[model samples]
Target chain A: AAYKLVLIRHGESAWNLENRFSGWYDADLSPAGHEEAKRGGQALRDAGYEFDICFTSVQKRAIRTLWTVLDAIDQMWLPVVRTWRLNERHYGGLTGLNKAETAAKHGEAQVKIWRRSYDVPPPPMEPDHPFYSNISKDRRYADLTEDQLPSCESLKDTIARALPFWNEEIVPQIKEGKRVLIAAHGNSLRGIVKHLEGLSEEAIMELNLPTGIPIVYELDKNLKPIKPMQFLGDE
Target chain B: AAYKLVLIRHGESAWNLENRFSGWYDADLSPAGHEEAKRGGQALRDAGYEFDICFTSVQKRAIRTLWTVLDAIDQMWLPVVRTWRLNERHYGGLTGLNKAETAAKHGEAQVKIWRRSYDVPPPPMEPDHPFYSNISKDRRYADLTEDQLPSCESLKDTIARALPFWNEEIVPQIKEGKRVLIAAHGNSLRGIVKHLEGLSEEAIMELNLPTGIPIVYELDKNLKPIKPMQFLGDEETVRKAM
Candidate 1:
C-alpha cells in the first residue's frame, strides 16, 4: 500500500488579514482563519481520512490550525509534535510593516526582490527592533543556540534548516507506516515541495500555497511520490 | 527546594450542567467551565507559576481545560501528555442519567450506597448499553486490554488504577525537576489527594474537590506534602457552586 501524507498550510492569520509581513511573528488565527481550518478538517472527515500523528510549527496560527483540524475530525487524542524548524521564514526588518508601509520604508523594487528572490533575504533585524528581543527571549527557543536563531532568512536559508527536520524526524515516521499530517507555514512547506518535486529555485519562488487546504501525497515503498499532489475539496 | 505541583479538576462539563452521570463520557466544557478554567490558569499566572509539562486525561473536557489553561498562561507550546489512566471513574449503567432519574430508577438508598461506599460499584454497564458501546469502541482506549476496560468502578477501584500512574509515570518526571501541571477529573485527583494525605476510606468519601480550582501541593524531596493543599481563588462564591 502507498504511504499517505497530508500537509496543510495554516489558514489566514491575524497578520494575513492586515496584509502584514508576519514571517515568524506568531500571530493568532482570525475568525475567518478558524472557519477555514474547520472547513478543511470537515472536508477531511467527510473523505474518511484518519491520521495517527500530527506535526505543526510552535507558532499559534499553525498550532491552532492543527488543533482545529484535530477537534473537527474528533481525534484530539492524537499525538502532536511541535517544532520551530517548521516556522515561517523570518521577515527580519520587515517583520511587522504592511505592504504599503514596507514599500514606503524600502523601495518597491528592493522589497520585491526580498519577497520574490529565492536567496536574497530582507534586511537583517537589529537587536533593538522590538520583535527581535521578544522572539530572542522566548522560552520555546531555549533549546536553540544563539546562532540557530535567525536575524533574517531567505528561502534558501529556510530550506537549509527545514529539510534536515523533514529527513531526520518526519521521514522515519512515514517509513514506519505512521500516517502523518503536517500543519505549517508557506515557506517551510515550500521547501518540502521543492525537494519532493525537484523544482528549480526560480520555479519554487513562484509556487504559492493557499491557506486551509490539505495537500495529499501518496508515496511508494521507496517514499517517492506515486502521483502529483492532490488538494482536498478541489471541486 | 520543595517541588511545586499543580492539580486542577476540569471545570463543569456539558454533562455536568445537565446534571448527568458523565463518568467515562466524552463531554465538552460548558461556557462557565471554560471561564473557570481560564480563571484557574490566570490565577497560576498571577502567582508566577510556570510548568514545563502538563498531564491530562484523553477525555476532551480535561484536554480542553488543559488547553485553555496553557493558552491563558501563554504556554501553549508546553508538552502535553494525555493518558486514559487519568480518566474519570466509570459510572457503568448509571452513565448519562441525572441524579433524579437515577434515584427514581434505582431507589435513593441503593444509589447513595453506590455513590458513598468506597468499594461498592454501580451496576456493570452491559455491552449493549449505548454509552458502554461508545466508550468500548473508542480509539483512545485502543491501548487498553478488554480486561483493563472497567464496566464500573468504585472510588476504591479508581484509586487502585490511579496510584500506579502517579507512582510510575508522574513521580519520575517530578523527581527530574520538571514543573508539572495536571488537568483531570475529580475522582482521579481525589485518588492522588487520598494517597498524599493518607486519608481513610471514610475520610476520602467525605472529601470533595472543587471544580476549576488549582490545588497546589508543595512536596519535599521524598514527595511528601509539606503543607495542606491550597486552593486557588479560595472564594465563597467558588466554593458555593460545589
Candidate 2:
C-alpha cells in the first residue's frame, strides 16, 4: 500500500453561486470560492501534506483554484499540467441556464434525469447558440475538431473521456510513489472516484463530493484503492 | 527566415523603482509594473505576435510579467517553463544595497567596474550576509550545488551560467521555428543578446534594454540575425540601437 492521489474539486464558481449549469462556460470563481481554496490549502498544510506535481482542468476557475492552493502551501514551484479531459461534463444547451428555473420549465422528473442519471445528457448546444459561439471561437481549442469538442456530455461520457488520462498520465506517477494532486470540476473528479473505487452505476450516484475538500485515496500495488476514499476534513 | 524569438525585460520591480541593485534577490513588481506588462502584451497583440511557448525566470517579478502578458493576450493556456538560469545577474554582496550609497561608499570608478565591466565581479557575498543568509536554505535552488550558485557574477560569468539553457533548450526550439517568448531580467537578457549578435565587450556595455518593450529577433537557418533586432514601438530606434 502507498500514498496515491489527492483530488480536489474547484471552489464555487460564479455559476455555482447563481445555481447555473456552467459546464465549460469558463465562469470565474466567486469571492467565497477564493476563500474556500485558501482554507482548503491551509487544511492540507496543517496536515503536513505536500505534492510532487499537480494536475488541473483547463478551465480558469480550476486552474486558479490550484494556483491559490499552491500559493498557500508555498509550493508555487510545483510543475503543473492541465488537461481537457478533466473538464466538467459539458452542460450542453443547458449551460448558462438557471437550474431551478430549468427544473420548473422542463418538469422536475425530466430535469432530475438530466441531472442525476448516469447516462442521460441534456440537448446538444446548437452551433448558433450564443453560449457555444465562444467555444467555437476560442483559440485555445484550435487543435480540437468540431466533432471532438462535445456540446453535451453525460457522466458516463465524462468518465470515458477522463479515464484515459488516469490510465496513461496519472497512474504511472502513482506507481512511482510520486504524490499526485488533481484539481478539477465536480463531475470530473466523480468520474475518477468511480474508476478508482469500481463503483456500479447506482453506487456512483450516491457519491456527493463537497467543494474544495481534499479526497485522499491510498492504493495497493496494482493501483486498486486499499480503503474507502477519505475526505481530509472528515478525518 | 522565421521570427524566432521575442525577449522582454521584466517590468519595473520594487527594487527597480527604489533604485537598488536587485540581482538574484527576487523582488515583486510594483503596481506600475503590472500596468506596463499589460501594455506590453497589448503591444504584442497589436503587432499580431503569438508564441508557441514562453520561458521565464523563476523570480516573481519576471513570472508575474509573463503572467500579465499571457492574461492580456488571452493566451493563458500557453505552456510556461521557469528556470533559474534566466535569473538576474547575481550581484553578490551588492544585492539589496542602494546603488547611490554604494557609489558613495566605494567611489564611482570601482562601482562602475562592479556594475558593467565584462570580467570584473563585485566582492563575493559572505554566507553570513543578511540578504544571502537564506539562499542556501531556499528549496528552489536545491538541485544546485554551492559551487554552482554564484555570490556575484561578471557579464562573462553570467554568460557561462546562462548559455547552457540557450544552447541546450532554447536553440532547438528556435531551429524548429517555434516563436519563443522569454520574460527575464536585464543582465540575463543581455547575456543572450551578446551571444546572438556577437557584440564586443565594449559594445555590450552601451546596450540598454528598456523595461516592457519586447525586442524581436528573426534568425536565419544558421541562427544568425536576419536584420537588426526590432522593438515594436520605434522600428528606427531599434534598428539604430542594433
Candidate 3:
C-alpha cells in the first residue's frame, strides 16, 4: 500500500553560487553542483531506491543534473518527461540580476516582502525585456499565456503551477505502483512539499531544501503521507 | 563549383583490434578507439571543414563515434540520419570468429578468397546463426528486404547496397550544396571510393583504408571527383597510429 515519490532540487547552478536571481534564465551547474548531483544518485542507489520514471524541468541545468543522477544509478534508459511547469519561480525583472544589488536598489523591507510573501509577486517584467520576449518565442512555451507566464512568482504561484502536474500526471503513475523521481528547481520543489506535507504558507517559506538531496515521501493507499519525509544521504 | 563529401571509418572497435571479421554485427569502440574519434574531429576542425549533415550506420560504434566527432566539432545539433544500408559488409558465417582462428580452421587460402573476393560471398549465414536472426528482428531494418538483409556479402555486394544510397540520398544533397559526412565501416567506404574514383575492382581489393582517418573528397558540378582524396591527419602520425 506504500507508494514512493522522490523530489530533488537541481545542483548548484552558476547563478546560485554567484548570488544571482536565476528564475527562468538558463545557467549551467557548477562543478560542485555536478558532483552533488552524482552523489544524490549514489545515495539513492545505496538506499535501495530505484526509479521507474524520472521528470525534470526543461532548463539544461535541471536536465543535466537529472542525467548525472540517473547515470549514477545506472538507470539512464528510464523514460524521462520534462515540462516548463517544473521550472524555477520566474524572477521577472530581477532575472539574472545580482540578489544583493536588487536588495540595494529596492529597499531591504520591500525586497523582503517580495522574497518572503506567499501571494505577492514582484513587479512584473515588461514584455520587451530580453528574457521575457525570448521565453515567449520559445516553441516549448507556445501554449502558455502572457499572464500564465509569470514575470515573477510567489511560492503560492509556484504551488498553483506544480500542483496540477502532481494531480494530473505524477500521482496517477505512483498509484499504479511506479516509483517517481522529479528533478526540479528550488521553489518548484518547495511548492510540491508544501502541498504533500500540509505546511502553512509561512512555515513552507521557512522550510529550506538544499540542492541535490533526494527527499523521499512514502504515501499510504489513499495517497496520504504515511510517515515523515526522509532526506537521502543523511543516514 | 565544388561539393564536399567526407568519409570516416568508425573508431577502433574491440572486434577490429582482436582481428575478428566484424561484418554487420554491431560492436562498440574500445576506449582507445573513442580517443581516436575525438582526434578525428580535431583533425577535421584543423583542416577547416564543416558539415551540414551526418549519416551513420545503425550500429552503436559508428553512432557513438559520430557523437564524439560532432561534440568535438561543436556541432552536436546537426541532424543525424541512420540507415541499415550504411552498415559494414556482412561477413556471413565468419562474424564473431577470430580471423586467425577461422583461417586456421578453414585454411588460409579459403579464408583469403572469402575475405578478398569482389563478387563471391562466403556462405550465407543460417537464420538461426547467433549474428543473423537476432539483427533481422531489429526494428530499424523493418523496411529492408531479405536480400538486403545480408547474411554474407562480398565487396561487390557491399557496393550494390551502398551505391543505391549514394544515388538516391547522398547525391541530391551534394547537388543542393549541402556538405555531407558519412560515418561508415571499412569495406562499405571502400565500395563508395571505388565508384567515385573509378578504381578497377582488382585495384580496390588492394586499397587498405586505416580506421579513424577522415578522408575528404571534392566533387565537381557533375559529381565527378575534382581532386585526389586527402586524409585529414599528419602523414607520419597517421601511419604510426594505424
Candidate 4:
C-alpha cells in the first residue's frame, strides 16, 4: 500500500494579523490563532486522517499548533521531529517592518518587485539584527548543506532548500508505508506543493494556501499523485 | 547566614486515594491531587519561598506535582533535575495489590509489622513482575549499584539509597549557593528529615508526613540545621487535610 502524507500551515501568528513582514522573527500565536489550530484539528478528524508520524518547524508557533492538533487527535505520545528546513521564507532586512509602512517608504512598485520576484532577495539583514543571531546549534542541522542555511531566501531559494529534504528524508519514509504529517509555514508548504504537482515556477507563485487547513495527499507506489490535493475543512 | 531548603511531598496520586501501595508504580495525580500541589505552591509563595533549582523523583506523580507547583509559582522555566534515588520506598510484591485485601490476607498485626518496621522488608518482587521491569532500562537508573536497584525496600533501605544522592549531588549544589527545592514521596522525605534531624530509626518509624506540604529548613555553612523546620500553610487547615 502507498503511504499517506498531509501538510498544514501554522495558524495565524501575531505578525500575520498585524500585516508585518515576519520573515524569521519568531512571533507566538495569539489566542485566536490557537482557536484556528483547533479548528484545523477538528477538520482533520472530520476527514478521517489519522497520522502515525508528525514533523514541524522548530519555531514555537508551529510547534504549539502541532501540539494542539495532536492533543485533539489524542496522539500526543507520537514521536515528533523538528527542523529549520521547513521555516518561512526569510524576509531579510524587511523583517519586522509593517508592510504598508515599508511600501510607503520604498514606494509601491519597489515593494511589489521585491515581494513577487522569483530569485532576488531583499537587502541582507545586518548581523546585529535581533533575529539574525538567534540560530540554535541543534544537531538536526548538522548535515544540512550550505544552500539550505540561508540568512534570506526568495521563493526560488526556498524551493532549493526544501527539495533536497523531500527527496532524501520525506519521500523514502512515504515509500516505506508510513503516514506522515508536516506542520510548517505558508511558503515552505508552497515550495513542496510546487515540486509535488510539477508546476512551473510562475504557476506556483499564483497559489496561496489558507492558514490552518490540513491538505491531504495520496501517492501511488511510484510516488506519483493519485488524487488532487484536498483541503480538510470547508467542505 | 544560612541557605533555605524546602522538602515537599507529592500530591495525592490515583494510588494514594485508592489506599494502594504505589512503590514506583508511576501513577499519575488526579485532579484533586493537582489542586493540592497548587495549594502547596500558594503556601510557599505566601511564606516568601523562591527557588532556583527544583529536584524530583522519576515517578510521574512527583514529576506532575512538581510541574503543577512550578506552573503556579511562575517558575516553569527554572532548571529541573530528576533522579531515581529520590523515588519512594519500593513496596515490591505488595505493589498493585489492594491495601485492605492484603491486610485481610496477612492479618492486621502482620500488616502493621511490615508497614511500620524500619529494617524488615516485605517480600522482594520477581524480575518478571510488571512494575519491576517497566523502567528497568531507563537512563536515569543506569548507574545504580546492584544493591541500590531494589525490587523491594524497607525504610532503612530507602534511606541508604537517598542519602548518597543527597550528599554527592544535592548538597554540593546548595553549597555553591543555589536555593534547592526537593519534590519527593512521603517516606523518602521522612527518611531525609530523619538523617537531617538526627532522628533515631525508631523515632522516624512513628513520623508520618502529610501529602502536599512544603516544609522549609535553614541550614548553616556546613549544612547543619540553623533553625527549626516549619511547614508552610494554615495550621488548622493542614491538620484537617492531613
The most accurate candidate by DockQ is: 1
Poorest lDDT segment (10 consecutive residues) of candidate 4 chain B = B134-143
Top candidate, metric lDDT: 1
Query: What would the per-residue lDDT of candidate 3 be over residues A1-235, giving only the tens digit for each residue?
Result: 4888899998899888899888887777899999899899999888877777887787767877886787677554355677788888877777767889988999899888888888888776777676776655654565588677666777788889988988898888988888899999889898788888788988988888889888888888877788888888955
Kindly provide the TM-score obtained by chain B of candidate 1 when compared with the true chain B: 0.94
Error of 4 at B239 (Å): 4.9
Counted clashes in each candidate structure: 0, 0, 1, 0
What TM-score would every model get versus the actual structure? Answer: 0.92, 0.84, 0.61, 0.58
lDDT of 3 by residue, B65-139 (tens): 776787667554354677777788887878778988778767898888887778988777777677776566664
Residue-level lDDT tens digits of model 2 in A48-161: 788887888878788878878877776766667788888888989999899999999999999999999999988998887888887646666666776778889999998888
Model 2 ranges off by over 4 Å: A1-5, A42-49, A144-148, A175-177, A213-235, B45-49, B100-110, B131-133, B145-147, B175-177, B218-242
- Pairs of colliding residues, candidate 1: none
Expressed as tens digits, the lDDT of each residue in B14-71 for candidate 1 is 8876789989989988998888898898888888889988999989898888888888
Which candidate ranks first by TM-score, i.e. highest? Answer: 1
Judging by DockQ, tell me the better candidate of 1 and 2: 1
Error of 4 at A52 (Å): 19
Q: How far does residue B178 in candidate 4 sit from its true spot (Å)?
A: 0.4
